[PDB]
Amino acid sequence: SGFRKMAFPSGKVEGCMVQVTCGTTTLNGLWLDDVVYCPRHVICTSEDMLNPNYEDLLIRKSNHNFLVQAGNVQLRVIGHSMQNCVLKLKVDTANPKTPKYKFVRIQPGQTFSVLACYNGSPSGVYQCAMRPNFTIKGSFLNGSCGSVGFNIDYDCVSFCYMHHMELPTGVHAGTDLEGNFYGPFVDRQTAQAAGTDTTITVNVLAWLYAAVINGDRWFLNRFTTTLNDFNLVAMKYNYEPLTQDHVDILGPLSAQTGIAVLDMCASLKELLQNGMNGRTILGSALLEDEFTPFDVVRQCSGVTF
Amino acid sequence: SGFRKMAFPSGKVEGCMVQVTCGTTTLNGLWLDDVVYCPRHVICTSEDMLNPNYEDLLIRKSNHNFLVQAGNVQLRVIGHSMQNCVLKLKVDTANPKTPKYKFVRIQPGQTFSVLACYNGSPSGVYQCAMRPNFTIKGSFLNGSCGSVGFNIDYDCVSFCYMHHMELPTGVHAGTDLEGNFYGPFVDRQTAQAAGTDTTITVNVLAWLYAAVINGDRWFLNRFTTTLNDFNLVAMKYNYEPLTQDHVDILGPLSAQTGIAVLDMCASLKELLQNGMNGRTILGSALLEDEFTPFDVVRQC
Ligand SMILES: O=C(Cc1cccc(Cl)n1)Nc1cncc2ccccc12
Ligand SMILES: O=C(Cc1cccc(Cl)n1)Nc1cncc2ccccc12
Numbered sequence: 001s002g003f004r005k006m007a008f009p010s011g012k013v014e015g016c017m018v019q020v021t022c023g024t025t026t027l028n029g030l031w032l033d034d035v036v037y038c039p040r041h042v043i044c045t046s047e048d049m050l051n052p053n054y055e056d057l058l059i060r061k062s063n064h065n066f067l068v069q070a071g072n073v074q075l076r077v078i079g080h081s082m083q084n085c086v087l088k089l090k091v092d093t094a095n096p097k098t099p100k101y102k103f104v105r106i107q108p109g110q111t112f113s114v115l116a117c118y119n120g121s122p123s124g125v126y127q128c129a130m131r132p133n134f135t136i137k138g139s140f141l142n143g144s145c146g147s148v149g150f151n152i153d154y155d156c157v158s159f160c161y162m163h164h165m166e167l168p169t170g171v172h173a174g175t176d177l178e179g180n181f182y183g184p185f186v187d188r189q190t191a192q193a194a195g196t197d198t199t200i201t202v203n204v205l206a207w208l209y210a211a212v213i214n215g216d217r218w219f220l221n222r223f224t225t226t227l228n229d230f231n232l233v234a235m236k237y238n239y240e241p242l243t244q245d246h247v248d249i250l251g252p253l254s255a256q257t258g259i260a261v262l263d264m265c266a267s268l269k270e271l272l273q274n275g276m277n278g279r280t281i282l283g284s285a286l287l288e289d290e291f292t293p294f295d296v297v298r299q300c301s302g303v304t305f
Numbered sequence: 306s307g308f309r310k311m312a313f314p315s316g317k318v319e320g321c322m323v324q325v326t327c328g329t330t331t332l333n334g335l336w337l338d339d340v341v342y343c344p345r346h347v348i349c350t351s352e353d354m355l356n357p358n359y360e361d362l363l364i365r366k367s368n369h370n371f372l373v374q375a376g377n378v379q380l381r382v383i384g385h386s387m388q389n390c391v392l393k394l395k396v397d398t399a400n401p402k403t404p405k406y407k408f409v410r411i412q413p414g415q416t417f418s419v420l421a422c423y424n425g426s427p428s429g430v431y432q433c434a435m436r437p438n439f440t441i442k443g444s445f446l447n448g449s450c451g452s453v454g455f456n457i458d459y460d461c462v463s464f465c466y467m468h469h470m471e472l473p474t475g476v477h478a479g480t481d482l483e484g485n486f487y488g489p490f491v492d493r494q495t496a497q498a499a500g501t502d503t504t505i506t507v508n509v510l511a512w513l514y515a516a517v518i519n520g521d522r523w524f525l526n527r528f529t530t531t532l533n534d535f536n537l538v539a540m541k542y543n544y545e546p547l548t549q550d551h552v553d554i555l556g557p558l559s560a561q562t563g564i565a566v567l568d569m570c571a572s573l574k575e576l577l578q579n580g581m582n583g584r585t586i587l588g589s590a591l592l593e594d595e596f597t598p599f600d601v602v603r604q605c
Binding site for chain 2: 001003006007009010014116123124126128139153166208215264300301
């Protein structure tokens with residue numbers, strides 16, 4: 001019993017974290033095989049950040065301008081290239097701790113674990129979701145750039161996020177490991193803002209199923225609804241639309257608890273229109289949207305890595 | 306910016322998790338140097354759990370009755386002894402992945418990371434607090450026994466908890482790594498219940514200071530309180546008493562934000578009286594009590 005915001009075990013990723021220094025800036029790099037990946041903004045000064053020409057700034061750097069430290073060992077940089085907003089530093093040593101990995105680009109609503117790092121040293125691990133507005137509500141201080149997000153699917157680490165920046169509202173923006181930003185953000189010191197965010201409906205439903213599995217049923221009711229009627233309610237309360245794909249994905253949880261997806265939608269509809277009336281669900285007074293249907297099944301079944 | 310419930314990176318502990326089997330029972334063990342630590346109830350059958358005599362059950366076991374698996378490698382048990390509610394299995398191989406470590410017994414209100422495991426394999430990591438009633442609100446299924454709680458301040462792993470059982474309310478009970486239970490619990494199937502749980506006041510205050518550090522001040526008020534008047538009110542909401550030790554501990558956060566501890570206590574008293582009025586604090590509609598003053602300074 002119990003339901004916690006749970007991150008994947010971070011060990012496989014900890015063995016990949018390195019410190020990357022370029023001039024006065026120190027941030028984190030991800031060392032996989034003989035390549036260290038890091039945000040391309042490591043090469044910028046504060047003035048360069050105002051309007052950077054990364055190709056021009058990079059052509060002025062030599063391999064020896066990048067100092068890479070793996071623990072207390074300096075790696076020698078033997079090549080450098082840029083792929084979108086990520087810098088790839090070729091090193092002379094393949095990381096002996098390189099796990100089985102893939103680079104995956106996730107969709108809004110998908111969750112992942114973040115291994116927050118400073119000076120190439122892991123400091124903490126937490127779970128978060130890619131918001132519908134493409135930001136992540138992370139916890140990052142100066143020096144955290146290059147920290148990564150990931151999932152583990154069997155014995156394979158799927159890297160999905162690299163930290164690049166903090167927006168003025170305190171939320172975060174980054175890229176996939178191919179350097180493509182999530183959201184309409186750019187790696188430049190210019191006016192940028194997170195768009196209006198919405199609630200990840202399928203994840204709220206998954207969390208309500210987790211609450212039922214954990215013995216919290218007060219919010220259940222005799223009613224059902226249609227996908228069309230529920231989507232009118234979802235739009236009204238700034239909830240993401242629920243698709244037939246989301247309904248299908250929630251099938252297993254619906255079968256286990258005996259509550260149809262549209263039956264759970266009628267519980268959610270009532271919660272949106274009336275609130276919790278002083279009650280809580282899984283120790284929360286808010287509807288939680290950072291657990292996917294897969295996270296709920298995984299946690300409630302004890303899948304290991 | 307941002308404030309998350311953050312666990313320590315679990316790698317150092319993942320390299321210590323092993324599977325321990327005794328007869329039909331399988332659970333997790335913690336392999337440090339040449340010793341595997343695990344709950345002593347691994348030697349019990351379902352019929353032994355009401356009134357087990359662990360000394361009598363253990364004397365009947367030999368080293369070869371304990372099968373320890375570390376990844377795909379079987380470790381050879383060359384000795385066994387019981388220390389309180391933990392079984393210590395001496396093995397013929399020192400764990401090459403043994404981190405720098407210590408065993409620490411924590412007090413209620415302290416937080417720690419839990420690396421939940423099944424069959425010696427880590428499944429997930431989450432952050433917990435030792436509740437005032439000595440339970441932990443974990444997330445553990447059958448087979449999670451032997452999973453550990455720890456902190457990793459300054460590269461040294463401080464092991465503080467080993468999971469032993471789930472109480473009828475769904476909360477969890479365990480021991481320190483010397484096998485001493487936290488709370489009045491026993492590793493027996495007898496009727497046991499968690500005592501009335503209370504809110505960890507010093508941690509709620511630490512989290513309000515985290516909210517102020519992160520830019521939120523809506524809950525602040527022009528009032529202060531005496532420590533005794535604060536406790537008289539807070540106890541009416543099932544909050545733990547705030548001691549002068551807690552006030553001293555909050556000194557650094559008070560100095561950083563410019564809000565005196567008793568001034569923050571007056572904000573807390575008002576929050577208890579009014580609720581949040583549709584507002585949130587650090588993304589929560591409830592007062593959070595599983596961040597210590599130390600956690601707040603570490604994260605902010
Ligand atoms: O945002 C940046 C640097 C930056 C500025 C402009 C554009 C880009 Cl791509 N990057 N770094 C940080 C990342 N996360 C958290 C932080 C907290 C405080 C101070 C800096 C933080
Ligand atoms: O509580 C026990 C075993 C035990 C130890 C000591 C005394 C007694 Cl009677 N039982 N195991 C479990 C631990 N955590 C979580 C669980 C969830 C579901 C089923 C078992 C769980």
